[PDB]
Each structure stands twice: as C-alpha cells, then as structure tokens.
Amino acid sequence: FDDKILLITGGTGSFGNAVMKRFLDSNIKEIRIFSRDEKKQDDIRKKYNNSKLKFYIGDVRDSQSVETAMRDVDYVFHAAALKQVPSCEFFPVEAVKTNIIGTENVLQSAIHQNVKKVICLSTDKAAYPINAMGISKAMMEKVFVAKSRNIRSEQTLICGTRYGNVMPDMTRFLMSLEDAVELVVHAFKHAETGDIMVQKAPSSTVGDLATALLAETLLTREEYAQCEDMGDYFRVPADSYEYNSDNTHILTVEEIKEKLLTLEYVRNEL
Amino acid sequence: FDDKILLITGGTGSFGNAVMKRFLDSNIKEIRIFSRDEKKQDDIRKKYNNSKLKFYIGDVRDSQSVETAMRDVDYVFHAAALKQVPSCEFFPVEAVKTNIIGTENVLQSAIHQNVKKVICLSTDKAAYPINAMGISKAMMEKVFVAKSRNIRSEQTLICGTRYGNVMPDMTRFLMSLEDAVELVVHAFKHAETGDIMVQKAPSSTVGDLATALLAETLLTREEYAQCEDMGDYFRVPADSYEYNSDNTHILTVEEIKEKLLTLEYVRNEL
Amino acid sequence: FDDKILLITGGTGSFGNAVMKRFLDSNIKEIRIFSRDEKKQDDIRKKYNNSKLKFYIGDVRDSQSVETAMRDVDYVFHAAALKQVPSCEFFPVEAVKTNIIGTENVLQSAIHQNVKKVICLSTDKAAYPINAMGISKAMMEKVFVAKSRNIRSEQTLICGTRYGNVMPDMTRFLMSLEDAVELVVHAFKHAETGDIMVQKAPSSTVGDLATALLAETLLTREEYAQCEDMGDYFRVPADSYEYNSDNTHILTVEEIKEKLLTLEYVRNEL
Amino acid sequence: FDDKILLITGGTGSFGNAVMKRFLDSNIKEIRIFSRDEKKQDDIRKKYNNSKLKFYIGDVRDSQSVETAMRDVDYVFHAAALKQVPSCEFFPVEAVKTNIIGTENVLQSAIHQNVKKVICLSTDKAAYPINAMGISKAMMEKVFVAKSRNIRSEQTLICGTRYGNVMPDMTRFLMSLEDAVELVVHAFKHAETGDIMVQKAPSSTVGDLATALLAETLLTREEYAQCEDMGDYFRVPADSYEYNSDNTHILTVEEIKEKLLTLEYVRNEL
Amino acid sequence: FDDKILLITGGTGSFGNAVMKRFLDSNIKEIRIFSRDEKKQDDIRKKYNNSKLKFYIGDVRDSQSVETAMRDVDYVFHAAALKQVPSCEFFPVEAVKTNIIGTENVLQSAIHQNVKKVICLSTDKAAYPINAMGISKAMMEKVFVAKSRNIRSEQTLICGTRYGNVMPDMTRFLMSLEDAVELVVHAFKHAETGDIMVQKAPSSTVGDLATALLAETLLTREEYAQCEDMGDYFRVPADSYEYNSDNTHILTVEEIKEKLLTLEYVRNEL
Amino acid sequence: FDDKILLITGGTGSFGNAVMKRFLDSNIKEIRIFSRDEKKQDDIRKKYNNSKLKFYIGDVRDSQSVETAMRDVDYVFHAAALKQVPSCEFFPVEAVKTNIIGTENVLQSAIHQNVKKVICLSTDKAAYPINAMGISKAMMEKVFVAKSRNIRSEQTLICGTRYGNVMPDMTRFLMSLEDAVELVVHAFKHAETGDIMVQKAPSSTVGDLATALLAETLLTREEYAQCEDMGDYFRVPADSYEYNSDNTHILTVEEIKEKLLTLEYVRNEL
Ligand SMILES: NC(=O)c1ccc[n+]([C@@H]2O[C@H](COP(=O)([O-])OP(=O)(O)OC[C@H]3O[C@@H](n4cnc5c(N)ncnc54)[C@H](OP(=O)(O)O)[C@@H]3O)[C@@H](O)[C@H]2O)c1
Ligand SMILES: NC(=O)c1ccc[n+]([C@@H]2O[C@H](COP(=O)([O-])OP(=O)(O)OC[C@H]3O[C@@H](n4cnc5c(N)ncnc54)[C@H](OP(=O)(O)O)[C@@H]3O)[C@@H](O)[C@H]2O)c1
Ligand SMILES: NC(=O)c1ccc[n+]([C@@H]2O[C@H](COP(=O)([O-])OP(=O)(O)OC[C@H]3O[C@@H](n4cnc5c(N)ncnc54)[C@H](OP(=O)(O)O)[C@@H]3O)[C@@H](O)[C@H]2O)c1
Ligand SMILES: NC(=O)c1ccc[n+]([C@@H]2O[C@H](COP(=O)([O-])OP(=O)(O)OC[C@H]3O[C@@H](n4cnc5c(N)ncnc54)[C@H](OP(=O)(O)O)[C@@H]3O)[C@@H](O)[C@H]2O)c1
Ligand SMILES: NC(=O)c1ccc[n+]([C@@H]2O[C@H](COP(=O)([O-])OP(=O)(O)OC[C@H]3O[C@@H](n4cnc5c(N)ncnc54)[C@H](OP(=O)(O)O)[C@@H]3O)[C@@H](O)[C@H]2O)c1
Ligand SMILES: NC(=O)c1ccc[n+]([C@@H]2O[C@H](COP(=O)([O-])OP(=O)(O)OC[C@H]3O[C@@H](n4cnc5c(N)ncnc54)[C@H](OP(=O)(O)O)[C@@H]3O)[C@@H](O)[C@H]2O)c1
C-alpha cells in the first residue's frame, strides 16, 4: 500500500464504505471510488474530507468509463452489482449486464492496465442458486475463474469472495460489515489466482435471534470436497458434505446478544 | 399448422432434426432451420429433399440475422445453445453470449414479428446448477420468464422445457429423442405464458443400465412445491420435496433393456 | 389520467418523488418509476405501499431497457440526469452519455411506443452555459427540439422545462419542490411540441436569504425576444433583454421568511 | 518536425489546407490528411504533387479508422467538425457524434498511439453558446480538458484553440486563414496540457467593413478572470470583464481596407 | 410523384444533382438530400432556392441517421458510395462500411419505413471485379438482391442499376449524366424487385475520342445468358457471350464529336 | 516451432484437421483450435488424445473472443469462413460478417498480440468472382493486403493463399488436402507481407475424371502479369494472359487414376 492505488467499483455501497473507513487513516496512495451515483459520491466526499479519496463517475457496463478509472491502479475490489433479489427476478437482463458482463469489463480493463490483483465480491446465494441474483452471481464466479486460467498471475491475479448476509427455526449466517472487509483483506493477501475464499462464520437460528432484543449454503457439497482449509476460511481453488448455516458453530441468545452489541448500528438509542 | 411457419433456432442439432422428421410429412407451411453451420444445413437439405424445409444462415448472437429469419414466423422452437459442460466451463462468456443474450435476441425478435408462441429448450442442469452450462441455462429460464410477464400472451406466448439426458449405483433420467419432441409438442399446445414444462420420466441407475447389454434433479424443492401436475408432466407457472432421478419410477434391467430396443440407433448391428 | 400510464425516468430523484406524492392518491392507472438504483427503488416501494407504483430497473443509456419500460406508456417525464456540476466537469463524457444520448434513447423509444407526451426536465444553467452540466443540458434542449420538428405532435409531443434551484449581494431564483412539479404539470397540459416552458419565480439576494433564520439566467436575451407570455410562465416555441434573478420580483427578509415556512423540510425542529 | 508525422483530421477543410501549404516545403516527415471525402482528397493529391502528403480515408466517428491513421503519429491537429450553424440546429445529434464523440475517439486513439501533442480546433461560439454548433463545441472543450487532467503530459499533451471568423453597427473579429494557422502553431509550441489558446485580434464593425469596397465573445467573463496573457494570445489553463469584438482594437475603413489587401482571395479581379 | 417524397442518399454528388435539376420543376412533394457534407449541402441549398429541397445531415453507416431521413419517404435513390478506385484499394474496410453495410442500413430502414421503391446505383466495375471499389460494389449487388427475395415487393421493391463512366486502341462506354438519370428513372418505373438494369450505350475507343478535339464489361457472360432485353436496356432478374465496350455500336470521330457537343460542360470556352 | 504456438481459426474444418495431423507429432508447443462448434471440437479432442491441442470456443465475428485465443500466439492460419456458394448467395451479409469483417478482427487482434505471421486462406473463386462467396473472398484478399501495407512485417507479417477445389468437357483444378497444407506451409516459410501464394496444379477435364472409376481461374490476367514464379507456386506481391484450369498440365485418365489412388478417402472399399 506504499504509494499503491486501490479502485473500488460500486465504491458507494455498504461494503465500499466499510473498506474505506478501514483503509483511510492508512498510508495507501489513493482510493478510487467508482460508481454511477453522483449523490452518494457527493455525500462521501464532504464527510471524510480526505485527499486520498478520488471520485470517479462511471459504470461497469461501459468499458471506456472503466478504463479511465482503471489507469495506473494496483488493486481492484469489484463490488459493483445488482444485488437485490426481486429486482433481479423482474429484470434478469440487467442482472446480466452488471453482474456478469460488468465483470468481464472490469477484468479486461484490469488486465489491460496491468492491475496486480482483482477481488470479485460474491454471495452465498451463488451456491446452488435458485434466484436470478444468485444465478447471475454464480455465473460471475465462473467468469472470473475462467479468466484467471488464461491470465498469468504475475500479470494480474483474479479471485473472489462469497459471503452470507451482513448486519422460524431455520438458520442463517452471521457476519458483520467488519467481518466482510476482513474476508476481502484476507483474499488480497493470500488468495491465489482463481480462488474463491469463504469466511467461516457462526450461524444462528432466525428464531433465537429475535429473542436477543431486551438454510444458507456457503459451499456446495462438491465445493466442500475440493476445498482447502485455512482456519477461519475455506479456499476453493480453480479446477484445471456441504458447508451451511445449519452446521457451523450454531449459537444461542447468550452469544447472539453479544455479537449484536458490537454493531455500532444496533447499539443506537442514544 | 395450416399454412403455419415454424422456426427452429439451432435447427441443425440432435433435437432440431427430431422435430423435423416428426413435423415434415405433415401439412405445416414451412419449417425454417436457422443455425450457423452451412455444412450441417447442406447435409440436411440434400437428404430430406422436401420443399417445406427452408434454410437460414444466421446466429442468435446477432439480432439482424434473427429478424430476417423471424419475419412472418408463427412458432419458434428455440434450441440454439452452447450445451457441453467443459466448453462452457472454459468459455463461460460464450455461454453467456449464446444461451442468455442469444435468448434475449430471439425473444425480442419474436415479439417484434408478432410470433405466436416461443418455446425455449432447457435442461435439468438448470435446477440447482453447479456448472456454467447449467448456470447460464438457469439464467436463460429467468430471462424468458421475465419477458413473459411483460408480454401479453395473445401477442406472444413464451415458455420453456427442461429435460435430462436423451439417447455406479447413482441414478439418471431416461428420455429418448422421441420423448424429447413430445415434451415440446406438449408445451406448444398446453403451456401458458411463463411456464416451465418438465416431462415425467423413468430414471434408471447407471449401474443397472450397462447390464442390459447382452442424481439428476428436474425440479428444485421450491419448484416442486409451486408446481402443477398434468399427468406425464409437471408445470411450473411463473411467480407474479424435490423431483429427481433417485425417486421416480426407477427401473431394473428387465425394463431398461426394453426401452433401449426402440432406439433406432442402439439396435444397429445390421 | 383515466387508465393512463406515466413513466418517470430518474424516478427515484428529488423530483420523481415530488411528482409521485402528487399523482398518487389520484386515479391514474400506473406510475412507472424507471432508474438504475434498486436501493432507492426499494425504499420508495416499502413506504408508499401503493399498487399504482411500478418499479423498473434500467438506465437511459441503454435502449433495450428503455423500451421495456416504455411499452404502453402514455406520458413520460424525463428527469434522468447527471446534474451535479463538478461530477460533470471531471466526467463530461458521462454527462454526454446520460444527458444527451440518454435523451435520444428516451425520445426514440417514446416515439416507437407511440407515447403521447414527453417532458424533458432542464435547468437555468442551460441558458448561456459555462459548465459541462449546463452545456450538456443546453445540448439536450436542442436535441429534443430537433426531434420535435421531425415528429408529428398527434403522434408524440415533445417539450421541456427549465428551472433554477429548488429547496453575497448577488441573486438567485426561488422555487420549491411543489413549484417544480407545477411547471411540469403545466407543460403536460399546455405545451405545444418543441416548447421550452420556464416558470416565473421570485428571486431573492443570497445575502437577504441567510438573514431569515431567526445572477441566475432563466432565459437568454434571444430567448426572451422570441418568447410568449402565459402569466406565471414564459413559453419559448421552436424556431422553424434577458430574464434573470436580478430582475424579477426580488424579495426581502419579510417575504423570504414566509416562503421558507411552507417547506415541510425547513420547518423541522420537532 | 525532423522525421515527425503530423495528422490532420478533417484535413480537407479550409484550415487543413492552410496548415498544409504552410508545413509542406518544410522538412517534416509526413503530413497525414484524414477525412471522409475521397473527392476533396483527390483534388488535393493531384495539385500539390508532394510525397510527404499521405491520404487516409476514415471518419472520427469510427475508432478503428482513427487508429489506423493514428499509428506512429507525433502531432494531431484535430480540425474535423460539423461547423455550420443551421445543419447543427436541425441535426444536433450529428453535431454530437462528430464534435464531441468524434473528439473522444481522436483523444483515446492519440493516447493509445502515444501521440505527443493533440490540438483541438474550437470557436468563439463555444463561449456562452446559444446554438448547437457552439454548444457541441463548448462540450468538446470540456471533453478535451477533462481528458488532459487524467493524462500525464509527457505521454500525451492535449490542448485547444478558439477562433472567431476567418476570411449593422455591431462588431465581429477579424482573422485571416494565415492568422488561424499561427494560433495553432503557437499552441503546438507553447500550450501546456489543458490550455485553451485564443488569439488577440482586431475587431471591426460589420458596417465599416462593407465600406472598404472601392458582438463576438472569445472569452467569457470567468475565462478572462482565470486567464493568462501571452502578448498576442490569452491562455486559459485548466482548473484543477469579458473579451469580445466590441472591445479590442476596433478599426475603421483605413485599416479594414489594408488587411483585406493581403487576402490572396479578395484581391482577385485579375 | 403527386405528394411523393424522394430521398437521395449521397444526394450531393454528380448524380444526386442530375436527378435534382431533373425532378425539381416537377410536382413531386419533397426531395430529401441526405449526405455527410454540410458544405456541399449549403452550396446546393443557396443556388436552387426551391422549397421542395430538404437537406438532411446523416451518413449511411449510421442506422439512426438513416431512419430520421427515411421517415415517410416513398422512393429512395441510393447513390451514397466510396467510388474511387485507389481510395478503396488502400481503405477496403471503409469501402465495406459504406458500400455494403451502408446499403444494408438503407435497405433495413427503407423496409421499416414501408418505402415503396429503392434503387441502388452500381457500376460496370462490379462485373468481374478486380479492384476493391468494384468488388465491394459487386457485394452490394448481391446484398440488395438477397434482400429483395425476402421482401414482398408490394411492401418494398428493391432494384439496382449498373453504369459505366459518365461525362490506346481499347474501348470504353459513353454515357452522359443525362443518360445516367434516365437509367434510374427507367428502373423506377419498370424494374421488378431484384432486377439489375443496365443501359445499352455506344462505346468509343479511347484513341478515337481524343481526336474529336478540334474493355469495359457491363454484363458478365453468365449475366448476358440470364438477361432480358428491353430495347435500350438489359434486365437481369434475380435467380430464385458478354456485354462489353468492344462490342456495342462502336463509334468514330464523326459521332464521338456530336455526342460531346451536348455536354453543357464540354462546350465551355464562353 | 520450438515452443511456438499456432492458432487455427475455423480449426474444425477439412483444412484445420489436415494441418493438425501434419503438425501434431512434431515439436510445436501448442496448436490452438478456434471455432464456434463444441461438437466438432469434442470429436477432435477425444480422438487425437494429444496435449498440444488446445480448444478454444469463439467466433471471428467477435473481437473479444478472438483476443483471448490470440494471446501469446506466434502464427495464425486463418481458415474460418462461410465457404458454400448458395448459403452465401442467400445470406451475403453473413458472408460479409465472417469472411471480411471476421478477417478484420483476426488481423487487428493478431497485430495487437504481436503475432509473427498470419496466413489467410482464400479461393480461386476470388479471381473474377461472380458469386457472393467468391466476391466476399476477393474482398477479404484486398482487406488483408491493405492491412499488410500499414503494418511493418517484423511486427506482423500478413499473407494469403488461393486454392481451387480439393478432394462435361470443361476443366477444373486438382489439389488434394495434402496439397492444400503444403501451399500454406509454403506461405508460412516464404511469403513476404502482402503476398498471395497460389499453387501450380494439374487440371483435369471433369469428363475424363469420371472415367477413372474402374474453367477455374487461379490468377486473373492482371495478376499473372504482376506475378513472380517460384517453381510450383506463383507469388502475387502487393502493389505499392491468365492462369486457369484449361491451360496447366492437363491430364488424361492414365494420370487422373493415379493421383486418386493416394486419397486415403477414395481408396475405401475395405
Ligand atoms: N448483505 C450484503 O451486504 C451482501 C451479502 C452477500 C454478498 N454481498 C456482495 O458484496 C457486493 C457489494 O455489497 P454491498 O453491501 O456494498 O452492496 P451495496 O451497498 O448495494 O453496494 C453496491 C454498490 O454497487 C454500485 N453499483 C451498482 N451498479 C453499478 C455499475 N453498473 N457500475 C458501477 N457501480 C455500480 C452501487 O453504487 P452506485 O449506485 O453509486 O453506482 C452500490 O453502491 C455485492 O456484489 C454483493 O453481491 C453483499
Ligand atoms: N442431451 C440432450 O440432448 C439435452 C439434454 C438436456 C437439454 N437439452 C437442451 O435442448 C437444446 C437443444 O439440444 P440438442 O440435442 O439439439 O443439442 P445440439 O444437437 O447440440 O443442437 C444445438 C444446435 O444449436 C445450434 N447453435 C449453436 N449456437 C448457435 C447460435 N449462436 N445461433 C444459431 N444456432 C446455434 C447448433 O447448430 P449450428 O452449429 O449449425 O449453429 C446445434 O445444431 C439445448 O439448448 C439443450 O440445452 C439437450
Ligand atoms: N435543484 C434541482 O433540483 C434542479 C434544478 C434545475 C434543474 N433540475 C433538473 O430536473 C431534473 C431532475 O432533478 P432532481 O431534483 O430529480 O435530481 P435528482 O434528485 O438527482 O434525480 C435524478 C434521478 O435521475 C436518476 N438517473 C440518473 N442517471 C440515470 C440513468 N442513466 N438512467 C435512469 N435514471 C437515472 C437517478 O436515479 P438512479 O440513481 O436511481 O438511477 C436520480 O434519482 C434534472 O435533469 C435536473 O437537470 C433540477
Ligand atoms: N470560419 C472558420 O473557418 C472557423 C471559425 C471558428 C472556428 N473554426 C474551427 O476550426 C475547425 C476547422 O475549420 P475549417 O475552416 O477547416 O472548416 P472546414 O473547412 O469545413 O473543415 C472541416 C473538415 O472536417 C472534415 N470532417 C468533417 N466531419 C468529419 C469526420 N467525421 N471525420 C473526419 N473528417 C471530417 C471535412 O472533411 P471531409 O468532408 O473530407 O471529411 C472538412 O474538410 C472547425 O472545428 C471549426 O469549429 C473555424
Ligand atoms: N462515373 C460515375 O459517375 C459513375 C460510374 C459508374 C457508377 N457510378 C455509381 O453511381 C453512384 C453515385 O455516383 P456519383 O457520380 O453521384 O458519385 P459522387 O458524385 O461521388 O456522389 C456520391 C455521393 O455520396 C455521398 N456519400 C458518400 N459516403 C456517404 C455516406 N456514408 N453517407 C451518405 N452519403 C455519402 C457523397 O456526399 P457527401 O460527401 O456529402 O456525404 C457524394 O456526394 C455511385 O454509387 C457509383 O458507384 C458512378
Ligand atoms: N474445397 C475446399 O476445401 C476449398 C477450396 C478453395 C478454398 N478453400 C478455403 O480454405 C478455407 C478453409 O477451408 P476448409 O476446407 O477447412 O472449409 P471447412 O472444412 O468448412 O472449414 C471452415 C471452418 O471454419 C469454421 N468457422 C466458420 N465460421 C466461423 C467463425 N465465425 N468463427 C470461427 N470459426 C468459423 C468452421 O468451424 P465451426 O463450425 O466449428 O466454427 C469450419 O470448421 C476457407 O476459407 C475456404 O475459402 C477451401
């Protein structure tokens, strides 16, 4: 990060911001926020009042606007997506345009600009997808994986990261926004080209959650078979029973309540 | 089919040909075979020696070549795909270009030409896909489904059909090529706009198959929940445990051998 | 508005929302909100809880996504723009892509769908522009004006509306958001094809404004020459000293304070 | 100009030719004339009978034809435009395609080919534009200015030049074609990346002109504020009362007549 | 021609003008001149001073600019081409873009606008072509011919016209500009969809020509075989020894001199 | 061929395969087969069972799929075409898309990837073409020839090869598939940039052929004039009576029968 330039596509999102407040008071050269929305960008600019933040208008659908932003960049965190389920169900083609083709553009541009590392953000919904958001995401995973095979890593390294949700008796994964940034920083440092990184996470029942108030699949069977264990993460390396919310360290109110406390968002009656 | 024109995209395939030998000696006006390959087209033309067969060079990636072929058509059987697994795994983007965007083009063109019915051919691999072929297919299903919502049916009716394979102890579905045409003819007649039709099929263990020589999922849990039963077919209608090869009428050698006999292909030592 | 369908491109904006809360409890058939951002769209959907609101994902840069949304629409309020000054100064091409070409797409699509009336929202900055936002806006005005000449009005009527800002001794125009909707409703009813409508508005000095706390050009000289007076609006009809903030009814604290009161936004210490 | 290659887009114009007869008997390597019209190109080729002149068919709307011409070029004088007022008023989009997007293509191609300097020819009409020609030109100025910020100058230097007209009591600027080439040669040598250069020019009243037979704005107020004085030129450098024809050295018949004499065009009754 | 609208693409050319001075003092509704060059268009506009002449900026490479011009047109004379030999030899792709794809655009647009008749101007060089101009022209002939098969004539009729040159012992065809317009008017009236019309023309030796100062192939062998004779024209109708300058009525000085006289161009020492 | 990579576009064809069985048991690094059809590719893969064979899905119409395949390639044999006559006659535009534009893409991509040599396969039908296949081929020849002028050879060398047919009294050329590979290997080694190579070949009468069972033009007059003789080949170098089947070594049954024998295809009653 000594004089290094980071580009975050979809930089104005929940995640882009979390990577920001993290990376900012650091000694990285420049953090390029790249997205469509001048309003969110304007809100970010004013508050942080920090010169390392560069704002780029553009969208991942358009190769020429990606290139401009991509010039002389070292690391890309590709977070730009259509990520809501109904919006993708009614407009699957838009899901395609952004999630899949948007990713081809980011990758081609990255390679052309001799970017060192690209990390594509993905979702547990891509593991056995049933909805268009998840499906398009699965397809984005295959896309970056195929690209990684063809590209020498010392030129450009290309990897991805699935996560479940951040921030009645059935179960769901528990990740904070702080936890999400971690997975990516982890991928940055340790991923080899083609890898999908997934964070090991506690997974509360949705019923026991609502009490602390005063099944999600992260790896397909086949992915768990092929994978590699890194401690708090599995690593699915590119080729050439299952990891889900019902079978990690499941928690009860006693623990559900504690993790909540740390969300600087939830602890708000001040 | 009185003076009706049928267009088959990917008309030169295993299926296109099966629909052909079926529909030909009929009284349909014209059967438009639309595909990329002049060689296969040439082989078809010579043999059948039948005036109702019209050959169109074009590909589904290209809207202008679709339109030409689409002019004054009544029914489309959309069979054009990249359907092999490794080829889609190494070239997912091509899978996207053909399977998903190819389908947007066919649909837009169909609608513009006031086509009456479009049937998109799909695959059991689209149900909980893990591979890019299947994934892109799943995405194609969402695409035609989304399009069907926005389009009045009396303008253009849009439906699809999944099938397993045609022609060690684990199980797999058994459909002939004759069985495959049936499913489509069925969809033609009875599908409402947005439907996915799936044929009920016997499903032998792969081990007991190889003996007659002298798990596949067709519906996701959620799809089986929502579906409607038509006898030899389920119907999944558009919104706004599972049906698989391990739990249909499973067969043993006695029955496996008999079905084989009818394949005009297998019974060949003449 | 009896069974009439309205489409608002950039429907998620300050203005789109103002037109919404206005048109909603009415008897219009359907109000299509068309924009890029699923998050804003999601926030709107939840709150209003109103069936006439239809949400369309798409962007004006893309003709195919415009068409989908444009199907069977009667009236379009074209509000989609890159409207901040610095963002347009650093990324003029994006300004071009959205403000000018976005507008060609909306117009072509409108015409093709036999839309009855399209209203393009514009800005005082388009009158003698010096910045890229204003310049691109000026260009958008010429674009819709040129299109209006070529199109019979009984097919599709095409007009636009400039306004100054809504919501030290130099002067600036004073329009509320309520005032802005008015101008558009006015254009809807009374504009002929090609017209630019501009609202007559009081124009306080920025110095006397900040006191009530307890030059903008709307028409170029040449435009004032050619224009037509409608009472609270000027009408600039298509061809084949100046109207500015220093010379309307200028106001002092006594009046500045009163208009403020009505902004349901400013009167907030509750 | 020792073995240097110059490309003139719109090379067949009034200006392209003036730069030609100037640069020709020099020792520059090659002067590439790039334009759409084979007829004008053919007329030029025949007459000059000079090997340094290379003729390229292409147009600035098309990136692939720009690249071909752009290969191994050192300096570009970008003169290709739709420059007549009514033609731009009726066909603003064409104005956009050529003047603005044509310029993005030329710039991108220039950069890719590691061109040393690009000079975009502009017009006084871009200063407070009211017409589409002027507006599109203003937009072209912002476009090249934005591009210059993002590009290191030692890679590719990007600048522009406004001029009034060349060759009843109100006033207008007086530049010859010889004067116009000068401004560009000046920009070539002295412009820094992002600069707009404007020539200081005498400005006769149109009434006193017609007698020698035997208001134009070059800088907006704001541009005059920010500018830098170079003697016979102002320099407007890129960010991060007015200069007009009514207030330069205005001339009377005595001087109007003399300047005329030098136009090798006007002195023609031979 | 009662209230009929004619569009001439490449309307600013030698031919466009000849069709103009012909059709003008008539009672046709509107003659749309469509081309790239505002300068030629401006020169035409001023001189003829005639309201039936409408000037359209656009180029045939661009479908959207064709459509605008094509709206409500009855007859198209497609004369837009890259027609010089060396320019096509060095830039064959441009030849392709204009001559072949330009023609696909004109045809598609014509059909969409329910144009009654389109006439594509072609050249003797398309008969056994050896150069890129001729080759691209040959290809344009096949293109319009293929399109004519697929299109019902009562919708849109599509035909073409080859001619040799207008205005040492080897031979060449002799057509005036007046003769060229004739061939087209002839095609307009009598061509069936798919026809190539060729004018029968006297063909002087180039040696005997230069004396009156005080081999070209129009039909390939195969084309002469298939053709139909109409008096002063052959008609080559669409499928599903040779006609050349060495064997028409060849002329000697006595006749060469006389035909010359009529060229209002040659008889100029006044 | 020491660690050299060969790409064959249209690699699945009659020719692609002939170049394969030739080059395979060699010591070349990698032979990239690039084409549209996964089925043919799959058939090739299985049989040869040889690691040097790499299979790429893509088509020449699409630049992005060409680039992927083109990365780090040393030699390209461009064999991808629409080569049947009727298919090109009915769909000339497809002929254009593949044969001409497909070739521009392959060339641009080749150059960008710093490919050493590209050989475009052509046909005797391009010499005085009368059909769209031949015409489009002629145009492809001009296209690669034009490109070769603009490109330094030490960067990328670009050449082509015409051949007649491989494998009543009128005559036709006789080349085997083995003969066809030869011509290309010859071009590989000896062609200079811009050359068209043509093989000297015996040319039997079609009547005397059918007896051994127990006019084609390769160079236009003008091409024979300009050409250079290399023994068993003519070489047509780029600029800045005829060679045909009726006048090579014509053969009678005695020789016709013998050449046949060697076709490992014809000698099949085993
Ligand atoms: N619950 C979760 O947070 C969660 C769970 C699993 C996976 N993920 C994955 O993590 C990634 C980012 O998540 P998030 O929490 O940051 O979502 P988010 O807050 O909605 O951020 C997405 C950002 O993408 C931008 N964007 C959308 N389309 C774009 C385009 N075409 N070009 C450029 N930018 C575009 C949007 O900015 P503009 O509107 O300004 O363009 C938005 O700020 C997603 O890909 C998602 O699949 C998230
Ligand atoms: N085992 C099975 O047969 C099976 C099982 C499940 C589902 N399905 C589904 O049924 C459909 C058709 O199956 P099939 O047995 O006919 O496969 P197939 O025999 O490979 O037929 C596919 C045809 O599509 C054509 N095609 C490919 N890309 C095209 C493009 N871009 N434009 C136009 N045509 C194109 C090909 O013809 P050209 O090469 O001539 O263009 C080919 O003949 C597929 O979508 C598949 O997913 C099949
Ligand atoms: N101060 C003012 O309010 C003011 C003054 C003068 C003139 N105007 C004019 O009035 C118009 C609208 O003003 P506003 O107050 O509503 O601004 P706004 O609140 O920023 O609304 C603009 C909307 O456009 C949408 N949008 C942007 N790019 C788009 C694209 N490519 N496709 C589809 N939608 C897109 C955005 O939604 P998504 O991000 O969801 O796509 C945004 O909600 C503007 O054109 C402006 O020039 C406004
Ligand atoms: N009165 C003046 O002369 C004056 C005053 C102020 C500013 N300027 C500026 O100076 C510049 C050039 O002026 P000028 O006097 O040379 O005008 P001009 O004589 O009309 O020259 C413009 C040239 O541009 C070429 N062109 C147009 N569109 C093109 C395209 N898409 N691709 C490639 N070439 C194209 C035309 O050549 P083809 O038709 O052969 O393509 C034409 O020869 C203009 O940008 C103008 O704004 C001129
Ligand atoms: N000697 C002859 O005259 C002769 C002989 C045989 C055949 N022909 C055929 O007759 C046709 C016309 O001949 P002509 O004598 O009129 O040639 P011309 O005088 O050069 O006319 C061609 C016109 O086409 C226009 N043009 C070129 N590219 C264009 C584009 N992309 N979009 C729109 N317009 C375009 C040009 O106008 P702008 O520059 O204003 O766009 C030009 O005025 C040609 O197709 C030619 O093959 C002519
Ligand atoms: N009789 C002859 O053999 C003969 C005579 C004279 C000249 N030639 C020339 O030699 C060349 C090759 O001849 P051939 O005998 O190999 O013909 P072929 O056997 O038909 O081979 C052509 C190959 O091109 C591929 N192809 C077609 N369109 C493509 C596209 N858009 N992208 C990528 N690949 C594409 C096809 O593969 P997919 O279907 O898998 O894409 C096909 O295997 C041709 O250009 C032809 O003009 C041949």
Residue numbers in the entry:
A (entry chain A), B (entry chain A), C (entry chain A), D (entry chain A), E (entry chain A), F (entry chain A): 2 to 168, 193 to 239, 260 to 285, 305 to 334
Give the exact sentences the study uses for this entry.
The transformation of UDP-D-GlcNAc in UDP-L-FucNAc requires three enzymes (CapE, CapF and CapG) in S. aureus. CapE consists of three well-defined regions: a Rossmann domain for binding the coenzyme NADPH, a substrate binding domain, and a 23-residue loop peripheral to the protein core. Herein we present the first crystal structure of CapE, revealing that this enzyme forms a stable and functional homo-hexamer.
Two structures correspond to the binary complex of the enzyme with coenzyme (wild-type protein and inactive mutein K126E). The A–B and A–C surface areas of CapE in complex with coenzyme are significantly smaller than that of CapE with substrate analogue bound. The reason is the dynamic disorder occurring at these two contact regions. On the contrary, the A–F interaction surface remains essentially unchanged regardless of the ligand present in the crystal.
